[PDB]
């Protein structure tokens, strides 16, 4: 038998749509189970196991979209414990023409080396992205021609385009909203490199994005969300994708490049700016990076605070750009910065002079990364365009590197450090690396090196207090 | 010892409930009032008797370990063992 | 479209159960045998009716929106509606 109720129940387009929605929910629960459970051990080596450690896992390049693309970015979330985000060039040749016109971003778990958890594709060259300040919703990105763009990692799996590549199925998520649609000319007239989630203290949702030009003009945006949208697309607000949830609305203009300038001219005299970071203790305090070797200090709604500029230790100006900033995530108001000179500084926000400065370490070459390990409060990782990586540990020494690794024969293009468990939560200082040969390659540090002994965060306040 | 763990469970992100009930059907104290505690403890005890049967009715060599109910107001969590079961309620997230 | 989405769920790490059910307690889609499919459909239909009743006795102004059920051998997952519901089954995590 088959019953007369089977026909309306199986057939109805609302009940078909209920299987679309219910299986979309089921899919993300099964991914989130893999995010809860999975281990690092799925690959032990395919590659040169490096001087730091014993064990390695690759993010496999045999996925045909990745098979002819070189890599250059790595981005991480502090609060989403275990998402790694990677960014990929055009292939010069030999894959699907639809993808060939487009740049690729891949969002990964350290415990999912089989492939991207999501794949996002983009109408621009990308070089900035950051993952959400709470509940991991969205990826925000900045681009070679000033598009600020957003991906929603939740959106079904089929509003976005898809292809079955060889045997296997992949989807290539077009971005859910772009600034490019905005009719009045208020978007970035510049290339970008800062895309910062301003953590909160204007409806359905609220948290903030701050994105920054090379030019020294800042925008701040809020994230705002439709209840549901027509699958034909928004008809009022055109920058959204067909059926999209999320749009960005604009609410600041700060002329940073004019305002704090060491000024002799109007058009190249304005400071080129290379970063923003917002203090995790209080999102009203931000610092900004410069080509003049200053780190500049600022606040959002009040007009004046001090000190105004973090200086080099030497008098006058020391004009080599700064190329990365990081605040110890443990929340002391202290930050690391380092020049394309090879010189490094460590500051406390309540003093214009460095609490330490260094020069002599990376053979005077370009340093292209400085970061504070989220696992040990004192421990910071520096990397040079000679394909060297170095660890320094401000409780052990502040003369130079505690450990050094030179990679060969592969050059290093990108390096990033992994996220923030507690030590009894199994904290896990893993480094993700990319070679000029184009593979992505993860090296895990020894847990004795990665995990802190007693009270190290306070012991670092005691260093800054005894100095 | 125990009440410090109750404060630990009360402290959780978006949470406002705790009830423990015993296998004889009797509630322990709550951060909710006694009328609410009586209503939740009794109703969920009946629902968990049906739940533990339902898993045993699918396989008598299996047994049940956790349960969730999501509702238009909030989500509810349930966790049973030999002598006791727990109810927790979490505001929308 | 929808069949491929059921195939997508059928392929996942440690997953095999997919059952779609009508409010007469009878199933409509399966990757499993009809006798077992109907055992799970009838049991989950009884259990949804007690779940919705329980939420309305807890708070008549509230209503049911999701159910999840974890057993030592597997976790069962249920997405209800007035006319229709989905059941899925997975190995533990």
């Amino acid at each position: 038998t088959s019953d007369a109720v089977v026909m309306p129940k199986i057939d109805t387009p609302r009940l078909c749509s209920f299987l679309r929605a219910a299986c979309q929910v089921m899919a993300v629960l099964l991914e989130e189970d893999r995010l809860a459970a999975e281990p690092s051990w799925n690959l032990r080596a395919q590659d040169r196991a490096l001087y730091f450690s014993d064990s390695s896992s690759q993010l496999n390049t045999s996925l045909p979209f990745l098979q002819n693309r070189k890599v250059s970015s790595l981005h991480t979330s502090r609060v989403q414990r275990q998402m790694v985000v990677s960014v990929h060039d055009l292939p010069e040749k030999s894959f699907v023409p639809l993808l060939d016109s487009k740049y690729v971003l891949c969002v990964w778990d350290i415990w999912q080396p089989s492939g991207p958890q999501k794949v996002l594709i983009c109408e621009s060259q990308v070089t900035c992205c950051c993952l959400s300040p709470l509940k991991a919703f969205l990826l925000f990105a900045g681009t070679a021609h000033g598009s600020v763009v957003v991906w929603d990692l939740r959106e079904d799996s089929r509003l976005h385009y898809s292809v079955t590549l060889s045997d296997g199925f992949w989807t290539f998520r077009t971005a859910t909203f772009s600034t490019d649609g905005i009719l009045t000319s208020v978007n970035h007239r510049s290339p970008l490199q800062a895309v910062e989630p301003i953590s909160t203290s204007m409806s359905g949702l609220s948290f903030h994005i701050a994105s920054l030009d090379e030019s020294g003009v800042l925008n701040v945006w809020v994230v705002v969300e439709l209840p549901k949208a027509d699958i034909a697309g928004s008809i009022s607000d055109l920058g959204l994708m067909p059926g999209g949830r999320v749009k960005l609305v604009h609410s600041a203009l700060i002329q940073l490049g004019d305002s704090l300038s060491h000024k002799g001219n109007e058009f190249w005299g304005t400071t080129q700016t290379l970063n923003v970071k917002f203090l995790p203790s209080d999102p009203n305090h931000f610092i900004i990076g410069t080509d003049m070797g200053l780190i500049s200090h600022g606040t959002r709604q009040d007009l004046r605070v001090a000190p105004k500029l973090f200086k080099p230790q030497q008098h006058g100006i020391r004009p080599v750009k700064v190329n990365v900033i990081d605040f110890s995530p443990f929340g002391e108001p202290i930050f690391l910065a380092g020049c394309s000179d090879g010189s490094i500084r460590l500051h406390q926000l309540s003093s214009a002079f460095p609490l330490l400065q260094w020069d002599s370490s990376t053979d005077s070459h370009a340093v292209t990364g400085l970061q504070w390990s989220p696992t040990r409060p004192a421990v910071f990782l520096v990397q040079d365009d000679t394909s060297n990586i170095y660890i320094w540990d401000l409780l052990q020494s502040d003369l130079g590197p505690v450990a050094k690794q030179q990679v060969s024969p592969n050059r290093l293009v990108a390096m990033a450090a992994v996220g923030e468990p507690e030590k009894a939560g199994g904290s896990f200082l893993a480094l993700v690396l990319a070679r000029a040969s184009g593979s992505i390659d993860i090296q895990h540090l020894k847990r004795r090196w990665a995990a802190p002994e007693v009270d190290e965060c306070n012991r670092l306040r005691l260093l800054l207090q005894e100095a | 010892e125990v009440e410090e763990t109750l404060k630990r469970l009360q402290s959780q992100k978006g949470v406002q409930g705790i009830i423990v009930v015993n296998t004889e059907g009797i509630p322990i104290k709550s951060t909710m009032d006694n009328p609410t505690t009586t209503q939740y403890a009794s109703l969920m005890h009946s629902f968990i008797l049906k739940a533990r049967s339902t898993v045993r009715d699918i396989d008598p060599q299996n047994d049940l370990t956790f349960l969730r109910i999501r509702s238009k107001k909030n989500e509810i969590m349930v966790a049973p063992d030999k002598d006791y079961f727990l109810i927790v309620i979490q505001n929308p997230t | 479209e929808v069949e491929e989405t059921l195939k997508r769920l059928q392929s996942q790490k440690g997953v095999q159960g997919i059952i779609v059910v009508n409010t007469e307690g009878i199933p409509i889609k399966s990757t499993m045998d009809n006798p077992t499919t109907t055992q799970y459909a009838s049991l989950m239909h009884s259990f949804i009716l007690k779940a919705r009743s329980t939420v309305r006795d807890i708070d008549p102004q509230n209503d049911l929106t999701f159910l999840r059920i974890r057993s030592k051998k597997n976790e069962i997952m249920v997405a209800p509606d007035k006319d229709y519901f989905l059941i899925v089954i997975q190995n533990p995590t």
């Binding site: 929910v25 993300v28 629960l29 989130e32 809860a36 509940k135 991991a136 919703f137 990692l153 939740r154 949830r245 | 010892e1 125990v2 763990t5 630990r8 469970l9 959780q12 992100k13 978006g14 949470v15 423990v20 322990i28 956790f66 969730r68 999501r70 989500e75 969590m77 966790a79 063992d81 002598d83 006791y84 727990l86 927790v88 979490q90 997230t93 | 929106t65 999701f66």
Partner: peptide, 30 residues
Amino acid sequence: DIPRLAAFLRRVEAMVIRELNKNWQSHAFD
């Protein structure tokens, strides 16, 4: 026998900490 309530709460808090963090985190009902 309050020590059995304490032992129960040790086992259950280990799961309930994990599961409440997931339910705090998840997108699954957006």
